[PDB]
Motif scaffolding. Structure first.
Motif, mmCIF file in Angstrom:
data_model
loop_
_atom_site.group_PDB
_atom_site.id
_atom_site.type_symbol
_atom_site.label_atom_id
_atom_site.label_comp_id
_atom_site.label_asym_id
_atom_site.label_seq_id
_atom_site.Cartn_x
_atom_site.Cartn_y
_atom_site.Cartn_z
ATOM 1 N N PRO A 183 0.769 -1.251 0.000
ATOM 2 C CA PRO A 183 0.000 0.000 0.000
ATOM 3 C C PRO A 183 0.803 1.306 0.000
ATOM 4 C CG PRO A 183 -1.203 -1.602 1.206
ATOM 5 C CD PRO A 183 0.156 -2.226 0.922
ATOM 6 N N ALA A 184 1.968 1.295 0.636
ATOM 7 C CA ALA A 184 2.800 2.490 0.677
ATOM 8 C C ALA A 184 3.590 2.625 -0.625
ATOM 9 C CB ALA A 184 3.743 2.425 1.862
ATOM 10 N N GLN A 185 3.650 1.535 -1.389
ATOM 11 C CA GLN A 185 4.365 1.506 -2.664
ATOM 12 C C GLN A 185 3.532 2.151 -3.765
ATOM 13 O OE1 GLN A 185 4.656 -2.361 -4.750
ATOM 14 N NE2 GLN A 185 6.779 -1.827 -5.279
ATOM 15 N N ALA A 186 2.233 1.883 -3.747
ATOM 16 C CA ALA A 186 1.329 2.458 -4.731
ATOM 17 C C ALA A 186 1.257 3.941 -4.447
ATOM 18 C CB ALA A 186 -0.049 1.843 -4.603
ATOM 19 N N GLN A 187 1.272 4.283 -3.165
ATOM 20 C CA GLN A 187 1.212 5.671 -2.736
ATOM 21 C C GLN A 187 2.431 6.459 -3.195
ATOM 22 O OE1 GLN A 187 -2.336 7.025 -1.114
ATOM 23 N NE2 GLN A 187 -0.346 8.030 -1.399
ATOM 24 N N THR A 188 3.483 5.732 -3.547
ATOM 25 C CA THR A 188 4.711 6.346 -4.030
ATOM 26 C C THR A 188 4.570 6.532 -5.526
ATOM 27 O OG1 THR A 188 5.999 5.101 -2.403
ATOM 28 C CG2 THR A 188 7.187 6.158 -4.234
ATOM 29 N N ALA A 189 3.928 5.554 -6.160
ATOM 30 C CA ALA A 189 3.701 5.573 -7.598
ATOM 31 C C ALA A 189 2.894 6.797 -7.979
ATOM 32 C CB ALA A 189 2.976 4.307 -8.037
ATOM 33 N N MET A 190 1.961 7.182 -7.123
ATOM 34 C CA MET A 190 1.148 8.346 -7.405
ATOM 35 C C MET A 190 1.968 9.626 -7.375
ATOM 36 S SD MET A 190 -2.448 7.653 -5.596
ATOM 37 C CE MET A 190 -2.199 6.243 -4.528
ATOM 38 N N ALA A 191 2.731 9.817 -6.306
ATOM 39 C CA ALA A 191 3.557 11.009 -6.190
ATOM 40 C C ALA A 191 4.494 11.061 -7.382
ATOM 41 C CB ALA A 191 4.350 10.973 -4.897
ATOM 42 N N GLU A 192 5.120 9.924 -7.673
ATOM 43 C CA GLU A 192 6.045 9.802 -8.793
ATOM 44 C C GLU A 192 5.376 10.212 -10.100
ATOM 45 O OE1 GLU A 192 7.999 5.809 -8.852
ATOM 46 O OE2 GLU A 192 8.915 6.686 -7.053
#
Ligand code: HEM
Ligand SMILES: CC[C@H]1OC(=O)[C@H](C)[C@@H](O[C@@H]2O[C@H](C)C[C@H](N(C)C)[C@H]2O)[C@@H](C)C[C@@H](C)C(=O)/C=C/[C@H]1C
Length: 396
Positions: A173-182
């Motif tokens: 879940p924190a990985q997808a949340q990084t994908a968004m910012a990215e």
């Protein structure tokens, strides 16, 4: 009801969800359930209700009407048509509707056709005649077509599948949340790369529109826009092809028909949408006021998910539901939704898919599923309908 927990229901609920949805349908239209990812949401099942709700104003898609908190990384790209209501939705969509009319898109056929063709050539290149129709065609076609449209330099496209994955079920879940910012980061940068470069691609168009007048298209909206026009034709159009094919390849009798007569193509590419359409449940909708979904009352702000998957199997609308018939009456499926938010790219999708299927059945002798249906594996995600991969083969 204690609230059906989808998560703890088996990796087969990703395989054949239908029985679980139908079972609910029988008891009523709405249901509270916890998604495999967690959060509490409502499920609206049963065709008639599904269609109905999709167009019901009381169900706003504007997060301001949701009592569910949005992480900052999300708040960033939440200023797009699919996540707003009138007058904003009206305002925005207007901005790009002319770009996706059957008439305009048709103009892209020559190119789309060539894109598919190049992709098929490379597939048949393999010596053993075995490839994954996923990484071989279903995936690269969409991302290209759209990327030339919105104007995404090709080297830049890889990071997109990467993210989309994280967006859909990621291994964290924190990985997808990084994908968004990215992604937000990239898009924003890209948006700027366009400024003053007199490009003629859609993105460049929007950057100019937005600058000329910020009241017609804010900078956030500009971002949101590019984001939505991209990540909305991916997972959906990419699985359309996959699901479509997996459907035609696991129903030899139908593959046969279409082979014999290719006029059934358009109508077969449609039943795919009905039978195994990409979107299992429409995107988030929040009641502005409590809604009495017949007996069951849904609170304002709760997350409602219209289950497209189920409505397509509701026998009172689609006889012999679970039967994959390409000569069926597919009139009225919700594959692309209903209402003001009806797919803006239904024409572009259809085109791609139609040219894609066309190619395969043709340029592939004795084409067949290369594994057993039971062997395939779907994505646990409850909002999508995609295969991890789709093996095939053809007369070497
Ligand atoms: C198989 C392909 C496709 C499927 C299954 C699909 C499905 C849908 C659905 C279900 C909706 C409404 C969602 C909801 O109301 O919850 C929708 C909206 C939309 N689609 Fe598609 N779509 C596909 C391809 C495309 C393509 C190729 C594009 C991009 C060029 C696109 C862009 C959008 C956008 C941005 C919206 C917003 C509509 C609005 O709010 O007015 N779609 N699509
Ligand atoms: C059009 C149907 C598919 O959904 C989408 O295309 C939208 C764009 C997207 O949902 C949005 O994803 C963003 C990363 C975050 C945004 N949030 C800030 C409000 C969220 O609304 C999907 C592409 C998400 C992925 C995981 C998916 O699989 C979607 C399937 C269809 C519902």
């Amino acid at each position: 009801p204690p609230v059906l927990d989808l998560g703890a229901l088996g990796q087969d609920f990703a395989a054949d969800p239908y029985p679980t949805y139908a079972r609910l349908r029988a008891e009523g239209p709405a249901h509270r359930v916890r998604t495999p990812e967690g959060n509490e949401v409502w499920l609206v099942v049963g065709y008639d209700r599904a269609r109905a709700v999709l167009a019901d104003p009381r169900f706003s898609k504007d997060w301001r009407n949701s009592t569910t908190p949005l992480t900052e990384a999300e708040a960033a790209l939440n200023h797009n048509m699919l996540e707003s209501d009138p007058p904003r939705h009206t305002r925005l969509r207007k901005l790009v509707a002319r770009e996706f009319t059957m008439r305009r898109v048709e103009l892209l056929r020559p190119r789309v056709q060539e894109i598919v063709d190049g992709l098929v050539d490379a597939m048949l290149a393999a010596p053993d005649g075995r490839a994954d129709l996923m990484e071989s065609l279903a995936w690269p076609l969409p991302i290209t077509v759209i990327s030339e449209l919105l104007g995404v330099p090709e080297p830049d496209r890889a990071a997109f599948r990467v993210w989309t994955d994280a967006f859909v079920f990621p291994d964290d879940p924190a990985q997808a949340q990084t994908a968004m910012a990215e992604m937000s980061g990239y898009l924003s940068r890209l948006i700027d790369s366009k400024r003053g470069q007199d490009g003629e691609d859609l993105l460049s168009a929007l950057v100019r529109t937005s600058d000329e007048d910020g009241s017609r298209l804010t900078s956030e909206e500009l971002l949101g826009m590019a984001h939505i026009l991209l990540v909305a034709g991916h997972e959906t159009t990419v699985n359309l092809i996959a699901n479509g094919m997996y459907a035609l390849l696991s129903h030899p009798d139908q593959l046969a028909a279409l082979r014999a007569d290719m006029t059934l193509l358009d109508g077969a590419v449609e039943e795919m949408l009905r039978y195994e359409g990409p979107v299992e449940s429409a995107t988030y909708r929040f009641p502005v006021e409590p809604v009495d979904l017949d007996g069951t009352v849904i609170p304002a702000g709760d997350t409602v998910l219209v289950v497209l998957a189920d409505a397509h199997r509701t026998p009172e609308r689609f006889p012999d539901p679970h039967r994959f018939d390409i000569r069926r009456d597919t009139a009225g499926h919700l594959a692309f939704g209903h209402g003001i938010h009806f797919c803006i790219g239904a024409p572009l999708a259809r085109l791609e898919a139609r040219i894609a299927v066309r190619a395969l059945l043709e340029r592939c002798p004795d084409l067949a599923l290369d594994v057993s249906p039971g062997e395939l594996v779907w994505y646990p995600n409850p909002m999508i309908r995609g295969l991890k991969a789709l093996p095939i083969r053809w007369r070497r």
